[PDB]
């Protein structure tokens, strides 16, 4: 070190933050079906350090430590695991789990300060008996139907716009079955 | 084409059906934590045929078709997906799901007609409100604590002994996130 059909040119550009708004498409929650591990505990045990070292050695300005701090802020979350199936997202803290059958509310295209772009896929929990986040957004470098390989998820109870504003913290999830070594390889290979 | 710590000599022999009973150890249900796809639909759509072809070309007697029929009988199941977490096994048929918090009831060492050996890990559902199988058994070429890569599961409502007798049908589950191509590779690489 690819996980289904290779990417087309539009898809590859899209993954690199280059795309036309007209090529963005709606997605179903099932693109994120599966069980997923938070990568934060891997950061916190030093097991992602090889990733930060490769990134440092390839950037002229940033040190290993600056890069590691960037991902520390980015990955931080107490949601250790996320399960998605049958329209339901389940959030695991410790031995506490919450869940909701989320309603899709479309997407939002963002342009970052760098000029690169990304798409958030928006969902809302309207179950009054749920203790899960009212608003969630998926971001995973994909702009049209395709099974996700890993994702960044924004979670909150205030508004969708509050989450659209969040640029520094993006809890990150890889397939649960991967070993720490396999997560590291994935991070170095895409 | 390995998914955590490489196997030791005892482990490798054990995976090949060679081991001393004294080296068998209890395991927790969490060794099978995750979500898992049935490989039967891959068989049924021709997507495992490359596996059967390699196996045929390496066996002096059996044809591609004889091998494929063996796995057809072996893999057959209507349980398309299995999810395991927090001591609960959840079985998915179509849009119907059942589940139970299973009680561990030890293991059973079997010796096959070939003289090779295997270990079944036994669980029982005692939840009167559950519609899940009363008895289940995991078999996955592992005889001591270790996260499973794939497993064979026996399921029934009669007795544990009935399942111990079953040698021809062994519904088989790989990590849900793998593409069909990745399942095929795994089957050709272990
Ligand atoms: Zn690799
Ligand atoms: Zn679940
Ligand atoms: Zn389903
Ligand atoms: Zn949990
Ligand atoms: Zn990413
Ligand atoms: Zn390697
Ligand atoms: Zn990859
Ligand atoms: Zn490979
Ligand atoms: Zn579940
Ligand atoms: Zn748990
Ligand atoms: Zn289901
Ligand atoms: Zn097997
Ligand atoms: Zn290949
Ligand atoms: Zn493998």
Swiss-Prot record, chains A, B:
Tell me which UniProt keywords the record has, alphabetically.
Cadmium, Cytoplasm, Metal-binding, Nickel, Periplasm, Signal, Zinc
Summary of the knockout phenotype? Mutant shows a growth defect and a lowered cellular Zn(2+) level under Zn(2+) limitation. Mutant does not bind cadmium.
Q: List the protein's name.
A: Metal-binding protein ZinT
What's one GO-annotated cellular component? Answer: outer membrane-bounded periplasmic space
The entry marks the following residues as binding Zn(2+) 1, namely 141, 150, 152
Say if the entry is tagged with keyword Cytoplasm. Answer: yes
Q: Where in the cell is it found?
A: Cytoplasm; Periplasm
Mark the transmembrane ranges: none
Q: What is its main location?
A: cytoplasm
What is the gene called? zinT
Organism whose genome encodes this protein: Escherichia coli (strain K12)
Q: Which Pfam families match?
A: ZinT
